[PDB]
Design an enzyme around this catalytic site. Structure first.
Site, mmCIF file in Angstrom:
data_model
loop_
_atom_site.group_PDB
_atom_site.id
_atom_site.type_symbol
_atom_site.label_atom_id
_atom_site.label_comp_id
_atom_site.label_asym_id
_atom_site.label_seq_id
_atom_site.Cartn_x
_atom_site.Cartn_y
_atom_site.Cartn_z
ATOM 1 N N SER A 1 0.826 -1.200 0.000
ATOM 2 C CA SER A 1 0.000 0.000 0.000
ATOM 3 C C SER A 1 0.865 1.256 0.000
ATOM 4 C CB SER A 1 -0.933 0.004 1.210
ATOM 5 O OG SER A 1 -2.050 0.846 0.990
ATOM 6 N N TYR B 1 2.555 1.956 9.664
ATOM 7 C CA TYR B 1 3.241 0.718 9.316
ATOM 8 C C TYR B 1 2.942 0.329 7.868
ATOM 9 C CZ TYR B 1 0.290 0.860 13.486
ATOM 10 O OH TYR B 1 -0.523 1.270 14.520
ATOM 11 N N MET B 2 3.791 -0.516 7.291
ATOM 12 C CA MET B 2 3.604 -0.961 5.915
ATOM 13 C C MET B 2 2.316 -1.755 5.779
ATOM 14 S SD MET B 2 4.284 -4.093 3.965
ATOM 15 C CE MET B 2 4.240 -4.355 2.194
ATOM 16 N N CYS B 3 1.359 -1.210 5.034
ATOM 17 C CA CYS B 3 0.083 -1.878 4.830
ATOM 18 C C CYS B 3 0.196 -2.974 3.783
ATOM 19 C CB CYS B 3 -0.995 -0.868 4.425
ATOM 20 S SG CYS B 3 -2.500 -0.956 5.419
ATOM 21 N N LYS B 4 0.077 -4.218 4.227
ATOM 22 C CA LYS B 4 0.153 -5.369 3.339
ATOM 23 C C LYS B 4 -1.184 -6.100 3.318
ATOM 24 C CE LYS B 4 3.906 -8.513 2.299
ATOM 25 N NZ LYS B 4 5.103 -8.983 3.049
#
Length: 167
Positions: free
Chosen positions: A23, A41-44
């Site tokens: 994302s 945080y890294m949206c996965k």
């Protein structure tokens, strides 16, 4: 005449964009979001078919610290890319639709929040598809949003891939 973008991409196939997706594009005015984005945080997000006959979206935030698994279920509303994320039995609800994708990368969705009597929320969902952030999506997502009456005041991007390993 002059109109588009807001509409939904006709004839869509999730099977073509199934799997894991990074994302890096989201538009939402909000107010107290800063207190949460401070540790973005890294949206996965992971797309997959849900029980009965819907979609099971598994969210995972990957950051330098750790990872958090969220639960998101998307039930088909009727048209390929139109669902309802309701919950109650009368009011306080919201929905989301599919805007358009770049062949097989950079997913763009449109959210229409309206919980209660009528708050009228307009948030945007954009997914990434490269090593780093992609401007094409940054532009197309922000331009569509800002061009329709908006700007940086309604834009939030999620960090790039995180924690390579997995415990």
């Amino acid at each position: 005449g002059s109109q588009g973008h807001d509409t939904v991409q006709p004839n869509f196939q999730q099977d073509k964009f199934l799997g894991r997706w990074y994302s890096a594009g989201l538009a939402s005015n909000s107010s107290w979001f800063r207190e949460k984005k401070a540790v973005l945080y890294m949206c996965k997000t992971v797309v997959a078919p849900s029980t009965e006959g819907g979609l099971n979206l598994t969210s995972t935030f990957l950051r330098k610290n750790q990872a958090e698994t969220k639960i998101m279920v998307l039930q088909p509303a009727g048209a390929p890319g139109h669902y309802t994320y309701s919950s109650p039995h009368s009011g306080s609800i919201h929905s989301v639709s599919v805007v358009e994708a770049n062949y097989d990368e950079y997913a763009l969705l449109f959210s229409r929040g309206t919980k209660g009597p009528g708050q009228d929320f307009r948030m945007a969902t954009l997914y990434s598809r490269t090593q780093t952030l992609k401007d094409e999506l940054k532009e197309k997502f922000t331009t569509f949003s800002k061009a329709q009456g908006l700007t940086e005041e309604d834009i939030v991007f999620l960090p790039q891939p995180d924690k390579a390993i997995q415990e």
